[PDB]
Amino acid sequence: PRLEIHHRFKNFLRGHNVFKERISDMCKENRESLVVNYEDLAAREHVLAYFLPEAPAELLQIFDEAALEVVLAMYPKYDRITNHIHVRISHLPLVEELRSLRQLHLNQLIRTSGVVTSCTGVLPTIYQNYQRIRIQESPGKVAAGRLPRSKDAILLADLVDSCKPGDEIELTGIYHNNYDGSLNTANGFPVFATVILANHVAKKEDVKMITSLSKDQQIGEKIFASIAPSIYGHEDIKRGLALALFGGHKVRGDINVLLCGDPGTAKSQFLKYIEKVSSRAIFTTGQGASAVGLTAYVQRHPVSREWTLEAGALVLADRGVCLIDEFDKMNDQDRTSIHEAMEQQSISISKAGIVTSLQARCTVIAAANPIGGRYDPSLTFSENVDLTEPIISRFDILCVVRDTVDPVQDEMLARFVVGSHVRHHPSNQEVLKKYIIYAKERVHPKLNQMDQDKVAKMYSDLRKESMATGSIPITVRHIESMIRMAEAHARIHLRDYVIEDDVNMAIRVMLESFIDTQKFSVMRSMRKTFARPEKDLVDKARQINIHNLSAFYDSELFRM
Amino acid sequence: SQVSEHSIIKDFTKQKYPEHAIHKVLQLMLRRGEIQHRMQRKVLYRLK
């Protein structure tokens, strides 16, 4: 640019106590961290604010040298600790969600966010010193939902091993088009040919008026009457779906929500309508999904790529919501791999060669397509399928369409058909959308010792129903799913307890699985639902569900 | 068909054979004198 900037730097090196207090944060303990705020320098000296639009690229180089002036004069010791000083320029207002995402806007420090999709962490000469990570550009939104062009990020040996795939972080930096492959003596870089450095890592009001609406129970009943108004569905089906919609110490668990209908019904499209309410949106599409969409292929590799870690749809929606559609288009081999991962909410490798860990925090929602007849043969559903039996029986609830000749249903759906043209003809619950986000993110209940007993009493009542004529044919795992469902009730009614009326409907959903497997004669037990040493170790197991009987506050029992 | 050299590696997965073990096998199949392998492996190497 100019040549007079060196003199201005020389003059600019001649309140700030916080700089002294902040720089000393790193010490003998080797914290390897230094928080940098831009505003204090720019507030004291307005000349620094003017350098933002003129020379931002040199400024980073200039910023590193000026920091050393304090370090070199006081503490030469930091020269032998990682042999580098990390600059962490803070946020720089502006904030454009869609306006700055353009190739014309290079040579600017830009703040945005993204979600990590895939990486090459499975691996143990200027370019060899650093590695590669894949970042997305459009975040999840109704308007931003259009498919973007993927950004390619490069870590400068600074955030390595500190970040994991699927982390909703904030990306900030300046966009320089340092594509070194134009000389045609190397490999090729993706479309956004830009060395994007990572400088930040994120966390891993009408609401007050909205909370007023929460107290009403008139709106609390239509919550399962308003999610799917297109087809009017079935009241049993939506109630279970709504419970998972809220998503509400060895705290493990699985929510296996499966549907059995037909693709022609908009149920296949019904899963698509949910993403409007959901804050994070996942594209399924079947084959050719986002990144590696559960399909494995091997081809001839480019000039320089390494093996890819297989990122399941679960990983691609970490701490979010993941949607699974088109069940028959999955590969069989991946189904076995993720089956244990779904139950364990993580990925385990026993090859002793590659070790890694990925998180899984979403609700698995998918619909299966029946092979041929549903229950036409006199044999069981699992034993007339070439697939393995036990994996099929892993699902807790099997939702299937009931009845096929419903003239009443035909009537209401018929008028909706005309409504299709009505909306599309020329013509001259968003309030509830923000309800779910606020409750699930701001309300974090704790554990109460005096309230676990009362809920657990009724669970035993369910057991004794099968203990009269039978031999322990029911497993507690089915109940284990029920506890989280009753938790979502408190979000609904805001009463902090659960009424038997809610459980009775929850009972029917639980029993629905038995209906599909057992002959219709079991429908008589619904009348009673309305009305309602080696041995020694067994007895204690039910009452406390702890192997040790001396686990009652042992921390204060022995010392005090 | 479809059981060429580029995809038969997937078949080895079902046989509990890692991709490193087949290397001792796949690279030595030409020394075995297999009729089918040589026609597939050599003709497509440069002639296409």
Swiss-Prot record, chain A:
Top enzyme category: hydrolase
Binding site for ADP: S268, Q269
Reactions that this protein is recorded to catalyse: ATP + H2O = ADP + phosphate + H(+)
Localization per record: Nucleus; Chromosome
Motif segment (Arginine finger): 393-396
Disulfide bridges in this chain: none
EC number, as in UniProt: 3.6.4.12
Domain MCM: 219-417
Molecular function GO labels: ATP binding; ATP hydrolysis activity; DNA binding; DNA helicase activity; DNA replication origin binding; enzyme binding; histone binding; single-stranded DNA binding
Functional note: Acts as a component of the MCM2-7 complex (MCM complex) which is the replicative helicase essential for 'once per cell cycle' DNA replication initiation and elongation in eukaryotic cells. Core component of CDC45-MCM-GINS (CMG) helicase, the molecular machine that unwinds template DNA during replication, and around which the replisome is built.
Miscellaneous comment in the UniProt entry for this protein: Early fractionation of eukaryotic MCM proteins yielded a variety of dimeric, trimeric and tetrameric complexes with unclear biological significance. Specifically a MCM467 subcomplex is shown to have in vitro helicase activity which is inhibited by the MCM2 subunit. The MCM2-7 hexamer is the proposed physiological active complex.
Binding partners and assembly: Component of the MCM2-7 complex. The complex forms a toroidal hexameric ring with the proposed subunit order MCM2-MCM6-MCM4-MCM7-MCM3-MCM5. Component of the CMG helicase complex, a hexameric ring of related MCM2-7 subunits stabilized by CDC45 and the tetrameric GINS complex. Interacts with DBF4. Interacts with KAT7. May interact with MCM10. Component of the replisome complex composed of at least DONSON, MCM2, MCM7, PCNA and TICRR. Forms a co-chaperone complex with DNAJC9 and histone H3.3-H4 heterodimers.
Name of this protein: DNA replication licensing factor MCM2
Residues of the full protein shown: 191 to 888 of 904
UniProtKB/Swiss-Prot annotation, chain B:
N6-acetyllysine sites (modified residues): K10
Subcellular location(s) per record: Nucleus; Chromosome
Subunit architecture: Component of the MCM2-7 complex. The complex forms a toroidal hexameric ring with the proposed subunit order MCM2-MCM6-MCM4-MCM7-MCM3-MCM5. Component of the CMG helicase complex, a hexameric ring of related MCM2-7 subunits stabilized by CDC45 and the tetrameric GINS complex. Interacts with ANKRD17. Interacts with MCMBP. Interacts with TONSL; the interaction is direct.
Pathology linked to this chain's protein: Meier-Gorlin syndrome 8: A form of Meier-Gorlin syndrome, a syndrome characterized by bilateral microtia, aplasia/hypoplasia of the patellae, and severe intrauterine and postnatal growth retardation with short stature and poor weight gain. Additional clinical findings include anomalies of cranial sutures, microcephaly, apparently low-set and simple ears, microstomia, full lips, highly arched or cleft palate, micrognathia, genitourinary tract anomalies, and various skeletal anomalies.
Recorded family membership: Belongs to the MCM family.
Miscellaneous remark of the record: Early fractionation of eukaryotic MCM proteins yielded a variety of dimeric, trimeric and tetrameric complexes with unclear biological significance. The MCM2-7 hexamer is the proposed physiological active complex.
Function: Acts as a component of the MCM2-7 complex (MCM complex) which is the replicative helicase essential for 'once per cell cycle' DNA replication initiation and elongation in eukaryotic cells. Core component of CDC45-MCM-GINS (CMG) helicase, the molecular machine that unwinds template DNA during replication, and around which the replisome is built.
Protein's name in the database: DNA replication licensing factor MCM5
Portion of the parent chain present: 687 to 734 of 734
